[PDB]
Amino acid sequence: ASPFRLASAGEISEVQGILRTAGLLGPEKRIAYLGVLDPARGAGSEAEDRRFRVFIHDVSGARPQEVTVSVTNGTVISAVELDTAATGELPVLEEEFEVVEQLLATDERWLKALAARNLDVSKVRVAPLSAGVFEYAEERGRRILRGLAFVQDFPEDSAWAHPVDGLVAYVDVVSKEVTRVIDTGVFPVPAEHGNYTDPELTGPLRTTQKPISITQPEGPSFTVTGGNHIEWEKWSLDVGFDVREGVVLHNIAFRDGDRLRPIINRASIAEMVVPYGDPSPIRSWQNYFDTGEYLVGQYANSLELGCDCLGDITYLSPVISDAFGNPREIRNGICMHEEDWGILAKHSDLWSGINYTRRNRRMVISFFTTIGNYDYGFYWYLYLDGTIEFEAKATGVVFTSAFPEGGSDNISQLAPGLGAPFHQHIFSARLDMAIDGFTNRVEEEDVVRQTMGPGNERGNAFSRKRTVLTRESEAVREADARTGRTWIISNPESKNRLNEPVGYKLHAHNQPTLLADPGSSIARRAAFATKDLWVTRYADDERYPTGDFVNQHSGGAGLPSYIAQDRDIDGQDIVVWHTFGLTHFPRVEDWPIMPVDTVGFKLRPEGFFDRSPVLDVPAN
Amino acid sequence: ASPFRLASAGEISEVQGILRTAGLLGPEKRIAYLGVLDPARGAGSEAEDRRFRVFIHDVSGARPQEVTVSVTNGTVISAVELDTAATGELPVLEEEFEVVEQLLATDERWLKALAARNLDVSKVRVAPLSAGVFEYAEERGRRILRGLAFVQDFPEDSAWAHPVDGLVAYVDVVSKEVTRVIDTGVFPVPAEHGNYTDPELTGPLRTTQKPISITQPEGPSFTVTGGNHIEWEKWSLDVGFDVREGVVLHNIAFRDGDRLRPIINRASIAEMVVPYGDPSPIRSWQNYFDTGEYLVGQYANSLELGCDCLGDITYLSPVISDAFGNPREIRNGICMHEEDWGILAKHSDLWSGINYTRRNRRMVISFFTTIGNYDYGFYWYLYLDGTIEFEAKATGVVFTSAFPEGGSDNISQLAPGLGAPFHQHIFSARLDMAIDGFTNRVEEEDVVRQTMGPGNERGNAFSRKRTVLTRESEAVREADARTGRTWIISNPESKNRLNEPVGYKLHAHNQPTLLADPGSSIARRAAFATKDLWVTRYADDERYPTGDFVNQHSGGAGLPSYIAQDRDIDGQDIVVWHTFGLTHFPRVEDWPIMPVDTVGFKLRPEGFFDRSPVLDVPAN
Ligand SMILES: [Cu+2]
Ligand SMILES: [Cu+2]
Ligand SMILES: [Cu+2]
Ligand SMILES: [Cu+2]
Ligand code: NA
Ligand code: NA
């Protein structure tokens, strides 16, 4: 009967029922976002109140609404009109992407542009992209999409191989008009196809790969009860799914003796942004917030057996709402399995004559998403030794442009005439901490070099220091790889047997953060991305590092507004936001389809246990 | 008939035969080191000359000798007496480790020390450690070992749980005398056992782990011919074994079309050092060069099936020499297998309606070694997409001391009274490059942030720069994680179809380098470890970054002496030396036996191919 259970189809149809009965979901209305709300803090001796949050867009053009519904009581808790010029446009609706190409086809400016390049409009695809906020005043309070053109020579052709550069169009998707068509000049269309299943380009496929067979004859070592509650090798959690964040982990905890010891209350990727570094006016506005503007959860792939996920796989098929409030199942959307992970520990002792080896493994929870040309895999891992890890795998087809004759400082060449603008992929993991409970504290730990002198006469000593982050005004931190900077989340009220606060250490990869100029528009909308680590005091309305409506919203929101409250985080209910990302100067090897690249982070115990927690792992 | 084949037992017994016949291996002589020499450059139309290098120690105390033998011709090429006070002591002999405890047992100073602490000498193990070079003048030209005491309460007890602090002894292992016994005061002996197979400490073992079965019903996709020549998924290499470096990879190359394209001519871990950061006079001298002083190859474990190595495993059993020149097989010393590696590439395209997924895998070549309390796994990986990776896995039992009452800035507490001095594990990978051949060049690539202004009006642009390292005086480089610094090795004379030099990019982990004071003795003996990347002009006598004899040798050797020649490295036969390491503030979870921690690096293609090299991978 768990309150962290996944949303069922019945609950979604019931939300729809409640909204209709209340006059809130007539035939002009559309769900832009629907998701279950996490139980409120405390909520112990108190039975549940399953609530759902909904953003309801109006196609006629009236003000949209934010609505909370209790499916427990069958009621609307609250409903309020939003002012989207102040607080930001709602997520882009799936039904509005189609509109961009359709409308552009009958627009004279668009056709004149296509005709100057000798292009047939029936062969010209348009990627409909999130618009952000810049110098266009007729855009504030409006839902705009920006269209970039790509030629498809035939229905099975990869249009990404044939970008139409020097051309961008802006479209208003509510009033259904083309607001602008910008043509900076004709660029030649890159001529080679990039059809990665065509034999002319692949050559004869390899016959040298012999099968690797991964099975579990007694089935998997984890259990799933209540739909989504996992127990595995002392670990305990609930796997949730939200249409925005995708897979969310709740109540991550570790069974130490007879004690269930919390570690992380909620773990999500709460934003991901892909800023482009090409100063071309055709692309200098390109910033996909895939989580915030698109809702990456809703484009989660169906994951096929012995192919996306290998081994003994347990699937979850999370349910979401479509634009009318009918439930939609995402079949096999979440993969769950365990894999071998080499050696856990090994020592061969001369003096005892005892030889000891133990195998490691990890629990994997994963989903995959597709937006346009981009494809991302999101993987959480739990290891036997208490380590928690996240990894993002980026693949898909790189976003293209023309390659300027004379070269470029901001674009690489993939094929003759074909460019790939430089860009980053930056993630924010929101980690609502609960190291042995909610009373937590972050310290920043740096290695300390010591001078040869009195007390260190051989000049070999080195040390470490820890600086407590006491208030949110001191809790916006940058990496220092050179001094091995990490951050320890500990519980000052829960000590280990050696009388030291229990903790977990966050190990970042220390990749570059947001490169854009600090005065730029993306540095303001994505302020989280300019720093590696932020710590806030928990509040229930502080969910996203960019705020609740990213679509076409400037600064004034998210992390920088949260931390300004300068609240006490020294032995309180806190939340860690770790920025981490890939910086991509695309290479020839990324074309015509990109091999996986990865980025992530991990947390390892740090005096959390009283000794190794894997002493009781058996041989074999 | 390959000249990169592993040494056979017949060849080693033949080296012994040649040395005896020449009067160089009488009954007072001992092999401290024996290894096959790599073929000389050129060596194409010229048939082979299998040569072996040998260091021959004399137990009576005469000068040791360096000898090169040709087993082809059955001759001594050269033999020369060494002056070990000038050029450094030979590697420690396995037979000399035993001597330390034996001699100390009858030494009055040692027993007086043991008697003050109420300790029975029959229960006191002594770790015999490499001595380095410090303020002791009677040590230069002498082979000294330093002994630290650990109590074993019974024959199957882990003595590491009971360090005897405040006590160190120095011993001369040729003349068989105790030169010094230093007692700084009695420290209590840590009382808890750390027996990780004892049920009282483990508790009942888990029964929750269900088997994971990894098989290959058609066998593995790689072939091994000529003992050690591997072909796998376009890759080609020879797996070598040296008693010092362990597993060495020769002729790493990639089959692109009908062309065999070299990448790395030779890849090894050419040094590894573990500097201790505790200023105690009992430990401030502790610096194990496991590769240089001990020869980690000679302590390679026998790796057992379905346990150290899982799956379809092909073993190699490399042969080495014992102290008398008899061959010794290391049975199942090298594991070779292939493993699944998740998704290689995936895109689901709306416009084409084509959905595409491909699985990745990697070839693994690995060995494991044990020195005293330390156990290390050394793993090379080749991926389908042309990426090459190394990873070191550290485990074993942490080196202990007493934990000072009043705490320590240089030691953590693992159990009541038990300390673990802070230390680092630092590796040097020597990569003799051959990117499409021997004419290579290194550039350092940093991300470039750009100011918002003319030509970048939205403030979104970013770029990259590359700086060619033209001479060895400019080729000692440090990491800059913040600017995403990497190093590209390219061939200026071999261009891809887009007319850019082919290359591979080295991606470091950017962990801290040597923390010791730059004026310290370890900063001088291990000068390589103070910088992330060094590039030298290839020479055949420049093998180790510390020089040919590390045992008790000061500066004046290795990398800093190599680079001073200031040779041209811009489009020449070059060698990259990448320093990378772990900095360890030991945690409670590392006791009583440490879970694996890892560190490494990788190289990925960078315009090496004309497009993705995995286009011809089949579905499934
Ligand atoms: Cu085409
Ligand atoms: Cu990218
Ligand atoms: Cu004991
Ligand atoms: Cu260590
Ligand atoms: Na919290
Ligand atoms: Na070279």
Coordinates of N, CA and C in Angstrom, one line a residue, chain B residues 82 133 154 171 242 245 254 272 285 290 343 415 419 450 455 461 541 543 559 584:
Chain B
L82 N 78.8 -3.2 -12.5 CA 78.1 -2.0 -12.1 C 78.6 -1.5 -10.8
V133 N 66.7 6.3 0.0 CA 67.9 7.0 0.3 C 67.6 8.2 1.1
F154 N 48.1 -15.7 16.3 CA 48.1 -17.1 16.0 C 48.4 -17.2 14.4
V171 N 68.3 -3.2 8.1 CA 69.1 -4.4 8.0 C 69.9 -4.4 6.7
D242 N 56.8 -8.9 -18.8 CA 58.1 -8.6 -18.2 C 58.0 -8.7 -16.7
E245 N 57.6 -4.7 -15.3 CA 56.4 -4.0 -15.8 C 55.2 -4.9 -15.8
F254 N 45.0 -1.2 -35.7 CA 43.6 -1.3 -36.0 C 43.5 -1.5 -37.6
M272 N 55.3 2.5 -10.6 CA 54.2 2.8 -9.6 C 54.9 3.0 -8.3
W285 N 60.0 7.7 5.7 CA 60.9 7.1 4.6 C 60.2 6.1 3.7
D290 N 56.9 -0.4 -6.4 CA 56.6 -1.8 -6.6 C 57.1 -2.3 -7.9
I343 N 25.3 -0.2 -24.5 CA 25.0 0.3 -25.8 C 26.2 1.0 -26.5
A415 N 39.7 1.4 13.5 CA 39.2 0.7 14.6 C 39.8 1.3 15.9
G419 N 45.5 3.0 13.3 CA 45.7 4.0 12.3 C 45.9 3.5 10.9
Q450 N 35.1 32.6 -24.4 CA 35.1 33.8 -25.2 C 34.2 34.9 -24.6
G455 N 31.2 39.9 -32.7 CA 31.4 38.6 -33.2 C 30.9 37.5 -32.3
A461 N 29.4 31.8 -27.6 CA 30.5 31.2 -28.2 C 31.6 30.6 -27.2
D541 N 67.3 3.0 -24.6 CA 67.8 2.9 -23.2 C 66.9 3.8 -22.2
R543 N 63.6 3.6 -20.6 CA 62.6 2.7 -20.4 C 61.7 3.1 -19.2
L559 N 63.2 10.6 -16.1 CA 62.6 11.6 -16.9 C 63.3 13.0 -16.9
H584 N 44.8 8.6 -1.1 CA 44.0 7.8 -0.1 C 44.1 8.3 1.4

